[PDB]
From Swiss-Prot, chain A:
Keyword Transport: no
A single BP term in Gene Ontology: positive regulation of transcription initiation by RNA polymerase II
Source species of the chain: Homo sapiens (Human)
Name of the molecule in the record: Mediator of RNA polymerase II transcription subunit 18
Main location, first listed in the record: nucleus
Gene Ontology cellular component terms for the protein in this record: core mediator complex; mediator complex; nucleoplasm; nucleus
Subcellular location as annotated: Nucleus
Molecular function in Gene Ontology: transcription coregulator activity
Protein function: Component of the Mediator complex, a coactivator involved in the regulated transcription of nearly all RNA polymerase II-dependent genes. Mediator functions as a bridge to convey information from gene-specific regulatory proteins to the basal RNA polymerase II transcription machinery. Mediator is recruited to promoters by direct interactions with regulatory proteins and serves as a scaffold for the assembly of a functional preinitiation complex with RNA polymerase II and the general transcription factors.
Curated annotation (Swiss-Prot), chain B:
Location relative to the cell: Nucleus
Gene (UniProt): MED14
Highest taxon listed in the record's lineage: Eukaryota
Tissue specificity: Ubiquitous.
Protein name: Mediator of RNA polymerase II transcription subunit 14
Family affiliation: Belongs to the Mediator complex subunit 14 family.
Signal peptide feature range: none
Complex and partners: Interacts with GATA1. Component of the Mediator complex, which is composed of MED1, MED4, MED6, MED7, MED8, MED9, MED10, MED11, MED12, MED13, MED13L, MED14, MED15, MED16, MED17, MED18, MED19, MED20, MED21, MED22, MED23, MED24, MED25, MED26, MED27, MED29, MED30, MED31, CCNC, CDK8 and CDC2L6/CDK11. The MED12, MED13, CCNC and CDK8 subunits form a distinct module termed the CDK8 module. Mediator containing the CDK8 module is less active than Mediator lacking this module in supporting transcriptional activation.
Role noted for this protein: Component of the Mediator complex, a coactivator involved in the regulated transcription of nearly all RNA polymerase II-dependent genes. Mediator functions as a bridge to convey information from gene-specific regulatory proteins to the basal RNA polymerase II transcription machinery. Mediator is recruited to promoters by direct interactions with regulatory proteins and serves as a scaffold for the assembly of a functional preinitiation complex with RNA polymerase II and the general transcription factors.
Segment of the intact protein contained: 292 to 388 of 1454
Curated annotation (Swiss-Prot), chain E:
Function: Component of the Mediator complex, a coactivator involved in the regulated transcription of nearly all RNA polymerase II-dependent genes. Mediator functions as a bridge to convey information from gene-specific regulatory proteins to the basal RNA polymerase II transcription machinery. Mediator is recruited to promoters by direct interactions with regulatory proteins and serves as a scaffold for the assembly of a functional preinitiation complex with RNA polymerase II and the general transcription factors.
UniProt subunit comment: Component of the Mediator complex, which is composed of MED1, MED4, MED6, MED7, MED8, MED9, MED10, MED11, MED12, MED13, MED13L, MED14, MED15, MED16, MED17, MED18, MED19, MED20, MED21, MED22, MED23, MED24, MED25, MED26, MED27, MED29, MED30, MED31, CCNC, CDK8 and CDC2L6/CDK11. The MED12, MED13, CCNC and CDK8 subunits form a distinct module termed the CDK8 module. Mediator containing the CDK8 module is less active than Mediator lacking this module in supporting transcriptional activation.
Membrane-spanning ranges: none
Origin organism lineage: Eukaryota, Metazoa, Chordata, Craniata, Vertebrata
Entire protein: shown range: 162 to 192 of 268
Protein family membership: Belongs to the Mediator complex subunit 8 family.
Comment text on domains: The elongin BC complex binding domain is also known as BC-box with the consensus [APST]-L-x(3)-C-x(3)-[AILV].
Stretch list, region Disordered: 1-15
Localisation per UniProt entry: Nucleus
Curated annotation (Swiss-Prot), chain G:
Source organism superkingdom: Eukaryota
The organism of origin for this protein: Homo sapiens (Human)
Whole-protein residues included: 152 to 451 of 651
Subcellular location(s) of the protein: Nucleus
Protein's recorded name: Mediator of RNA polymerase II transcription subunit 17
Disease per UniProt entry: Microcephaly, postnatal progressive, with seizures and brain atrophy: A disorder characterized by postnatal progressive microcephaly and severe developmental retardation associated with cerebral and cerebellar atrophy. Infants manifest swallowing difficulties leading to failure to thrive, jitteriness, poor visual fixation, truncal arching, seizures. There is no acquisition of developmental milestones and patients suffer from marked spasticity and profound retardation. Progressive microcephaly becomes evident few months after birth.
Amino acid sequence: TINMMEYLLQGSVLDHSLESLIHRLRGLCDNMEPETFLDHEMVFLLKGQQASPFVLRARRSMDRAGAPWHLRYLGQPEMGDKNRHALVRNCVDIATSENLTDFLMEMGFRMDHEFVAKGHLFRKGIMKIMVYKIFRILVPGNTDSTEALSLSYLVELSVVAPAGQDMVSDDMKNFAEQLKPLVHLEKIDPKR
Amino acid sequence: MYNCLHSFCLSLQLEVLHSQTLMLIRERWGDLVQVERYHAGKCLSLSVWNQQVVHKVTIKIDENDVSKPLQIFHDPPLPASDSKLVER
Amino acid sequence: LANERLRALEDIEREIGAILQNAGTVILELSKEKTNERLLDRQAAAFTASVQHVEAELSAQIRYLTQVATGQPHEGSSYSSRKDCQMALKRVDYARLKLSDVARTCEQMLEN
Amino acid sequence: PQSKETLLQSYNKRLKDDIKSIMDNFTEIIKTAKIEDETQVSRATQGEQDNYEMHVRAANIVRAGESLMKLVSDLKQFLILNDFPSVNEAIDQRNQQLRTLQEECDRKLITLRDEISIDLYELEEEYYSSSSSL
Amino acid sequence: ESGGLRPNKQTFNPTDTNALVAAVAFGKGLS
Amino acid sequence: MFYHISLEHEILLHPRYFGPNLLNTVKQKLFTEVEGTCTGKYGFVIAVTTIDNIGAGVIQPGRGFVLYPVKYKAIVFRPFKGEVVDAVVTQVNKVGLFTEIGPMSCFISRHSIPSEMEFDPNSNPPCYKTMDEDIVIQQDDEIRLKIVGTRVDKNDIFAIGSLMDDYLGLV
Amino acid sequence: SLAGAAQILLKGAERLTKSVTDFNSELLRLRQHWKLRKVGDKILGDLSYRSAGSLFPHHGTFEVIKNPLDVQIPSDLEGSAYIKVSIQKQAGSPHWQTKLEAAQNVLLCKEIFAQLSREAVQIKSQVPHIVVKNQIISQPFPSLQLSISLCHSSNDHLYVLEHNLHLLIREFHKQTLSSIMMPHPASAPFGHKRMRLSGPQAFDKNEINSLQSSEGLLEKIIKQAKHIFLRSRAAATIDSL
């Protein structure tokens, strides 16, 4: 199988201007009614003999009933050329059954941090723009009570390219440029 | 004057038919008809009923025709004599 | 969007006013007996104020444009709903036609 | 963003050059008209020259005002062609009208179908049972 | 007296950006 | 300065482009690489007004490519040392000022800035203002800067802006 | 000299006031119904369903000119066109509104007939068809002959199949622009919903192939026509009986 690289550009919008950005994205993007998704994500890390712990991100859609949990592996950043102006990571996307939490724990993966993300999803061609407000989860297990991690909302432009050819980043840079006056989407390194 | 005008209009008709053939190949037929040979002002060969799923249809202009009327030529098969169909 | 309409109206009004003012002032300039002394100065002041106002309004409205002058031509259209409704109306018209034809045949039956 | 920055710069430059020019042309008309002492050139030249100059500057001012009107109209068209939030709201509003129309038509057609079907049933129970017998 | 500024309402906070991305990647403010 | 000069450039045409429309293909290709690239000796090249002449094609033995020497006329922009040119400020920072002159971008160091000029961090838009506010420099403003010297790298030229000379800056 | 100046100024201003006290209103109304954009000084609009997921390589760009305004239709989209489907037993609105609706209808009829003629020529089907220039002829039943023809006016008919042709190509557009492709889990990539459900809720071969089926507008239309003919036949037979 070929591998799937995810090109990601990440930026933030303060809540007061959220309405302007939502209207703007709707205009540039394909004419589809907004998704309004809500989801819960728990990251599992494997503490094996090698120092680096394998990180697998498990996502459950609380809002959409009868939809399978999604398990994804995100690789180390492959960004090199300054011209690309994008973050490149290897990605494997696998739909999983509800009994995902138990399989991972028996295998030995350990639950680490859990977050709940609520926001709007819009798409233009392959490009997908997700605008969401991350909410911290307190209490050992539950989604009833959440506190806001920040007033602002992260905006991420993600493309799951087949890894064939390139210029995928160029298209992304052009789209990012339009939102740049409303919000500066840039490639921010995860480190610090 | 007649020879020059005739040569010009027949070459223009050849070009129009070639454009029509390429337009048909592009949109509807799609490799169900092919272009074997096209000489601007001499002949244009169209192949139908390909070997995959050969025959050619040549449309030529000869300087000036007086003794014999200039019509089309189906070169490879030389179709049999069907009084109603060969005339059309 | 009535805001933009009002803006344009004000713009046109102010422009016309300022050019009338300029006209009057130059007419009084050629005048052999410029009786409108203080009046003329007041007119000059008014014209200047008008120009300044126009400039400010224009700059603000340009920003209002460039706040969403995304350049992007905008995709989203109503073509879907419109086409659907047109189809529905044509279907209802066809139904009406058939009903009328059946009614006419029934009338014919009664006519004998 | 680059292309939006350039559009803003061009419109703003149009407006700035424009206020500066109308004010300066009025100033040139007043630097003039001032009947100053004449010498060498002679009124026979100075006079006609001044008249022509005033006429030309008046034309220039009128043209600048016409350009102002043109730019205003352009801004108006841009704010109706592609404002963006107003346009999205308007698209949503037309979707509403069309959808309601469709709903009404659908209900009408369904009811019509039902009534016509009942009539058809009555006729099917009749015609079939008719004695006749050719 | 062409005043000075008129619209300085910042749409995005870079500190906010940093914090959010940081959390998403490692997990600051979530454990 | 904007200078219209003729350039000598070479074209490597792949044989696949041979056949119909080979001559204008070279003309079309010429615009592809000349536009968007700069050189220190001639400065940034904006556009090719016309092609003066087309040279004969020389194959490279073994390679199979062709060498077309083309004489074309184009306008170029090159900063010169010790000259004053109008500029536009792009971004304002305490460390220095970044200004763009078309394709050319110039950086102004804090030292080159006048001593009485100071950065205005408190103001939401980064800008430089004086104590008396007699002269204010802000993003997207007209200023004149003296080029201390012309320095180039990776087909890009950016110089230093000097405001010490008289009749410089915004007016 | 100042008299001349003043005269010119007044004339101009009063001319501007005469041109001030409905091109603007007309353009505004033209925008809500038809999407528009700004390029150069020849402001254009969209006259294609490309927003509603149609992969037809044609530019639906109609111009707007000052003449209180006129709409310029792209060439070859003028006149009136209507597709005609027939069975033989052998073998109020605004001025520019009418023009733009008619040209959009012509564009959609060309889209329909391009789809039908390509599926007739290239897709292998039972009892093959003949596509001559603007006319498709099929023989669904041996005594039956169905004919689909694109009548382009350029200034026996069954309406039901024409109406269903329009709705079929409309659903074929809306399949691409569907909300079923949206992944509600933010992490989830993209694609249809039941194709996502195929993984955990394990599907057989038959459900997988039923979600991703290959057929065509022509195949479906022929099936519909055959069913209609069969119904008619049975009805007539029972009537005679």
